Design a protein around this ligand. Structure first.
Ligand SMILES: Cc1ncc(COP(=O)(O)O)c(CN[C@@H](C)C(=O)O)c1O
Ligand SMILES: Cc1ncc(COP(=O)(O)O)c(CN[C@@H](C)C(=O)O)c1O
Ligand SMILES: [Cl-]
Ligand SMILES: [Cl-]
Lengths: 359, 359
């Protein structure tokens, strides 16, 4: 069989080059980076080069941190629970501003915070699919400790106006976190433009392994550790480093960035091909704005069918994809897809479409 | 060159079989276990078999949890910070009992807890190297929320009387966590014998990859998540699973347990060989008790030399090891060592010994 993968916002294949680069750290460079002897020191250089790659991915300066984590969910829980202790409790700054769009790691953590007594406002989503900036402007109180808005949306592919949000946040004196998980490798990411104080990502959205990610922390911004024990990552996050996955994720980030133009021109073109082909069906509205999306995503709906039903049929034709908020169907490409696979999807989708209608 | 690795309590080589089993999950079974389509469902079976292996390693029942984490430091921070919220805050049970022996993840987290207002008593270590049980008996107040004692000590290899501690904890109504990181693969581990409510481990102490670990949670014991977001691990710890490392760590645990007798009879014998050979030097006292140690560790001191100096010289002779509390030298074997390598160490150590004395 010839299977087609269109669920890249759920996770992604590890790049062959990523696999190849981690391999010697599963084989004989197994030493613990903290060890003082050769087994440890010999991992130094590769670690350093990984970190360089991460820095250059997100336009982070020497004086900033990019801390390695076990995934974006760790990152996001760290940021929220750290600012709770540093701001909400110790500074009485008892309010967080976020959106209804956010990943559940963010939203569940916020919920928990409310349980303890933080007030969290959850910004509503507009007709244009997006949040405005002015919406955050108008929410930022005296008490506001942090604003958290995701860079791009995992369900619709919509880019939020981070940066404008950056500015509104600078002007008003407030901590700014952006969850940038679905922006890496998909559009350029620049914490400087963004005035991020905090930024999250996870390798497996850009062809590294599941099980690692980063939190960008800006210079001189405190954030009480989520993993105390304090020896690794300048005491910001304790635990023996995941050497192999570090090295992998370096590589991934690099390749991700190198492919920005390819993502834009080629993958985006593929997405468009697909999109147009599918709008030719009947009442197949696309979902949300079409102009401010990451290149690789399209969330279509289909008049009289469930998303789940569509998905299940697609699966039997060896095509993988997932749902989103109405349900609707999310098709999420990557550089690994080809025009052949799109064409095929167009066929198998339309057949499936026609074939499920009468029920 | 022929290098000799004796720093197994710092980390360990991934077993070839562990490497081999994770490999297809870095290659083409890259789907996200949550996905509903084949790419996801096809990871189901291997995940399940991994989990089975983990269960059987630690004598955990079906109705218990073994939750996958990013490492033992995650585990330990989870346990302490969860019981703070479930017990210290919500039940007014404002005291934790632990030892001075514990890993810094435990101790730093405790320190942080104190910062917020928990009272933590830190049980002092005795002349016999160990903690008694009666010592915990006598500390358990009305207010005591949790007792945390490590199963074996990473610095000395000393086994604490967990189980007796289990009983004293059952009788008095108190939550029992044991950090068992250095017991996996080294002596049998049995949460049932132990009345653990919580038990930690990390794969890289038993020849799986760094960057994953477990928290055993006993049936019906709550523990407010450290990673909110709640979709993975029955909502106890959110984040896309580390499929490859799961599968690896399964395998590791299995092999670890299969090798218990080999660890006892062969590795322990090797350790003894080494130990005796080195006691023949001059005022080379061994450090702590010699009778209740995991098979693989020995912490020697050397009359007139620093530990660091000894280590550095050893490193130049291609032998890897680390220090411990007075400083002293820790030599930590695994099944991968051979009598040849010991012999060699005996030589290179004694030469180094004699050669560093006059200064
Ligand atoms: C924007 C965003 N933030 C955070 C996460 C969580 O990353 P980890 O699971 O690596 O912590 C994801 C992945 N989500 C999946 C569940 C999806 O979109 O289908 C995401 O898309
Ligand atoms: C008893 C114990 N608990 C917890 C940990 C932390 O595990 P992770 O780093 O996998 O979270 C270790 C490893 N320690 C090293 C630093 C040593 O003994 O030399 C340990 O020995
Ligand atoms: Cl915290
Ligand atoms: Cl928590």
């Amino acid at each position: 069989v010839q299977r087609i993968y269109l669920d890249n916002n759920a996770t992604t294949r590890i790049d062959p080059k990523v696999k190849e680069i981690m391999d010697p750290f599963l084989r004989d460079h197994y030493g613990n980076p903290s060890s003082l002897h050769q087994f440890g020191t010999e991992t130094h250089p590769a670690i350093a080069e990984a970190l360089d790659k991460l820095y250059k991915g997100i336009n982070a300066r020497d004086i900033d941190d990019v801390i390695i984590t076990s995934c974006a969910t760790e990152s996001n829980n760290w940021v929220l629970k750290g600012v709770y202790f540093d701001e909400c409790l110790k500074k009485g700054k008892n309010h967080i501003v976020t959106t209804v769009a956010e990943h559940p790691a963010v939203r569940s953590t916020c919920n928990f915070l409310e349980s303890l007594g933080v007030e969290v406002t959850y910004l509503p989503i507009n007709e244009h699919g997006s949040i405005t900036a002015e919406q955050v402007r108008e929410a930022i109180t005296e008490k506001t400790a942090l604003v958290s808005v995701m860079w791009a949306n995992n369900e619709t592919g919509l880019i939020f106006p981070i940066e404008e949000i950056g500015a509104i946040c600078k002007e008003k004196g407030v901590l700014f976190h952006t969850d940038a998980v679905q922006a890496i490798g998909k559009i350029p990411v620049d914490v400087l433009k963004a005035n991020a104080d905090f930024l999250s990502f996870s390798a497996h959205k850009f062809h590294g392994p599941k099980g690692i990610g980063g939190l960008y922390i800006r210079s001189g911004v405190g954030l009480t550790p989520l993993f105390h024990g304090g020896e690794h990552m300048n005491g910001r996050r304790s635990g023996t480093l995941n050497v192999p996955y570090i090295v992998g994720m370096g590589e991934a980030m690099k390749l991700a960035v190198e492919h920005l133009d390819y993502e834009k021109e080629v993958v985006g073109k593929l997405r468009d091909k697909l999109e147009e082909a599918l709008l030719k069906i009947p009442d197949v509205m696309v979902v949300g704005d079409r102009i401010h999306r990451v290149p690789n995503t399209t969330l279509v709906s289909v008049r009289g069918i469930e998303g789940e039903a569509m998905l299940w049929d697609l699966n039997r034709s060896n095509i993988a994809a997932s749902t989103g908020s109405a349900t609707a169907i999310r098709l999420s490409l990557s550089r690994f897809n080809t025009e052949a696979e799109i064409d095929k999807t167009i066929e198998v989708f339309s057949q499936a479409a026609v074939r499920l209608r009468n029920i």
